[model samples]
Target: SMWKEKVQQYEDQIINDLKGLLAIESVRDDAKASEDAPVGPGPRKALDYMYEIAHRDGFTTHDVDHIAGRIEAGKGNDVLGILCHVDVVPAGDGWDSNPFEPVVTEDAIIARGTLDDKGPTIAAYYAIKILEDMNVDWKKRIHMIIGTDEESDWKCTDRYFKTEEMPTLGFAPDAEFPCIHGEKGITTFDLVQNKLTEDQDEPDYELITFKSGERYNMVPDHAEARVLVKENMTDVIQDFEYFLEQNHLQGDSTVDSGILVLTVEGKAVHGMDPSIGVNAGLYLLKFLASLNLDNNAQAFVAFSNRYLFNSDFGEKMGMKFHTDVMGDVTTNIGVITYDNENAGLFGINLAYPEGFEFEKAMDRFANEIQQYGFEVKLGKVQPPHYVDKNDPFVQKLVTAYRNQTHQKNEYITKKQLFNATSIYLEAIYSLCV
Candidate 1:
């Protein structure tokens, strides 16, 4: 009762602080990256803002090369970890409001990181603040570990844990929680076109460039392609418009200086589950597939159409597998880039259940795609994270949750369980960013 009252009392402050943090636009920026701002100014600013709060609250803080940091409170050698990130995926297209400018409605705080880590980070900070305000005797030191690159990579944690102390136990408030005791393994790879044997016969169109998506973890919200068309401009434009209408999709096409630029827009969702988002990139490719294009253009579009379009389980790729513990092997073609003069590549993010032979499956996939004259290059591999649901540390979380809500601990045996106090913004658990 006292905990709830204290937490409730601080709700306003928490929201305000969250608004300030979310406004930072902490998406990774390679262009603005520097020695001080390794990831970008926004991420660095976020890390700085966190330290500013820690210092203002008189808590001990440590900055680990600006990529990550931690705020320490209470006292004891045994440490409790609360890992959270400040960086976010790009503030993609189709937001009702400016994503960085947080909107506080009567019921929700809406922003880029509102349901992601920033909101949860603030909530955890307030929880620690509550304990500090009460001056209660603590048996373990509390470390609020802050990361700057959780949306792209786990570099922050990799560097932090390497140099800093590992907590005896920890939980990341970044996912759905009764508690997530098991996370599917994630593997990212790229299908690259090393050489396209452009057909000798001239086709009706030549693809100049294709581009879409911001990160491998997000369903691309926008995609655009440029093609030099030999066909009548009116026919191309009318066909594209008709295609959009037939599919109930949104897009626009324009012919400028003999080059037709086509754009398609879709919804963005986390790549871990691709069923929710519309995937604008794939839709654009599907449209391109319908046209009379050269071999190079058709290969890209055909590959996308056959293997990825409308198939989130990699069923067409001959790589679908499932387990009762981790659900299914989901896939997303999150990033794509192509140029007629150079190689084109698209990133694939796959989340698979344990017991799936990752190496064997990837080998099979690579072998199969090679037959289609595409090269498969492995990107990053993160093994699944699973703590025994029966571990005492896990049961302690269950007990705390039950005590707080006066509910039964029946959720203990549930697979992929998570807590709900904050936004479970990501379906990713194994891959940090």
Candidate 2:
């Protein structure tokens, strides 16, 4: 209860610092990189803000290449890593207020990185600061490692470990609480359709261009496809309308230069679990598969529909591995592209839990698809990390968290998840209407 009262004393200062950190807009900016600010001006400014406060509060700090560093305290044999990040993903659209601007209410603070590393960073910093004043001899050093490239390739952590001593045992306050002790391994790969050797002389329809999504970790909200059709464009348009009606979906169709452009709007969410959001590109492909397309186009549409359209748990590819703790293997066909001249491709974001034979499954996956005129191209992989729940460090952290909140630190409930889109949608809709 003393920790609670002590924490309350810093409430005013916490809010002030949080607002300051929230306003920095610490996104990656390669163009603005200078010798002084390596990642960009924003991330540099964010790191500078941390350094300023640490200096003012009488704590030592280190800046690593202006990309990753830590604020230091305590004197002990081993160090305790309180890993946190300043860098945030770019705020693209759909905000009621400036995402960089903090909105304080009686209950919650709605800002870009409020629930992310920034808020947690401040919390951890203050906790250690309070502990520094308490009547206890130090047993472990604390390094609140500041990260700049977390939303990027994690070159920040990579650079940090190359020069600094690895923490004895640590955890990043960058995920769900109860705290995530295990994470599904994530890998991105693109399935490229090979060039067609056999084809029909002439067909009723040819897929000119098909495209959807941006990031491999995001579901597509909208998709557009252009197809060249031979005669009677009205019939195709009518069929599309019927398709939309039958599917209870929203879309639009247009014809220009005798090319049919069909677009569909679907609900978009993160690629971690593709079960929730509707994949607009897949729905568009489903429509394409219904059409009498040319040889190459038909194969592209068919393969997409069969393998990934409804393979929610990766059952189609025989990769639906599951576990009691982590649930099932999830797949997101995030990005898709096709053109008449070149090969068609779809990017997959597959996350597998422990005990999943990722390599053997992928090898089999590659072999099976090879006969279907497809090749697998691999990208980056983030292997899973874990710490046993019974570990002393983990139990100590859990005890403090439970004591503070007095709430069960179990798996995140459905009620706990918050989408900024919906929050702003209602909050801004009231403004407009």
Candidate 3:
């Protein structure tokens, strides 16, 4: 009765607070990136908004290099942390309503960050309010660590933890409840500098440029390319129209200054699972396969179509691997680009299970792709994080959850989704709880 009443008291306020936070488009932007707004103005604004709330709520706050911030309550030598992020993945295409506008329905609050971090962050913040209302005897300092780049590289927390104090224990209310105790390893790699040998013969087509995707961790929802048709351009355009119609896909092709520009639209999703989204980049290349092209462009399209378009398991690339403890090694060709002269590159996000050989598999895959005139360059690599199920810290949290909810053994094994909260947050929650 007390819990329900307390929650009801703050229900409207919580929703309004969440709406305020969700209204800001916090997607990272590189072009708008500046020294003060490293990630972008949107995320910076979100961070400042959170700080405003923290100040209004009367919690001591600290700004972390304008990229991250912290809200502190209670007092003690040891600290308890609750990790959260304000930044979100691009709102992307295919939204029934404006992605940035927060919509409160009877059943749910709809918005970009409502489910992902923002909602949970507000919930966690309110927990402090509830605890203060109840006047619980606080023993440890509670630091709500606000991050701005968790959707991308975690530069916010990475830098904050560098100069700030580490929590004795903490939790990130960012993932599923009953707690996540393990997470798969995450790695991103780039295939670059692909080139084709030149010939004196006139080519059938020339690719002026090709581009797709905004983030390496997002399945591209849009792709476009410009090409100079050498012969029978009209035939290619007609066939493209037919191909689009046959596929039941929406796209457009127009001729500007004698160069044919083509655009295709696809669905976007988190790169952690590529099966859910139709990558527009891959499909555009699939369409290009039907027309003529120069050696370089042809090789680029062929390489992508053969190794990436229809393959999410790395099966075509001789790199697929799996384990029961985690799952299959999944891949998403999140970004594709070609400049028409110097180089062409593809950015891939890979999520692999535990007990898999990272070095061996990557080396083998790289050696195989060298024959295709492609080179592999690895990016950030976060190894798997796991905590024993029987550990006392985990058991304590489980017991607390069970006692509060009257449920039994509701714990679920950790997965990549928990990587956002558990890898570091769970460790702290375990110690603090």
Summarize candidate 3's per-residue lDDT along 145-202 as a digit string, tens digits: 8888654332212577557765544554333321222566789989886666567566
Query: What is the per-residue lDDT of model 1 for residues 1-433, given as tens digits with 9 covering 90 to 100?
Result: 3445545566667766777898898988988899999999999999999998888888999998889889997676556567788887786656677787877765566677765677668766876775666666666677788888754333212677557765544565443321222566798888987667545787789889999996658899899999999857898899889988888889999879989999998999999999988899999998898888878777888889888899898888887897543478889999988888765778999888654677888888788888777888888898765454633344555555665541111111001111323111111111111
Best model number under TM-score = 2
> On a 0 to 1 TM-score scale, where does candidate 2 land against the true structure?
0.51
Which residue segments of model 2 deviate by more than 4 Å? 1-180, 197-199, 387-433
lDDT for 336 in candidate 3 is: 92
**Candidate 3 similarity to native, TM-score:** 0.50
Model 3 / residue 170 / CA error / Å: 16
The backbone clash count of each candidate, in order, is 8, 0, 3
How well does each candidate superpose onto the true structure, as a TM-score? 0.50, 0.51, 0.50
What candidate 1 gets wrong by more than 4 Å, as runs, is 1-181, 197-199, 387-395, 398-433
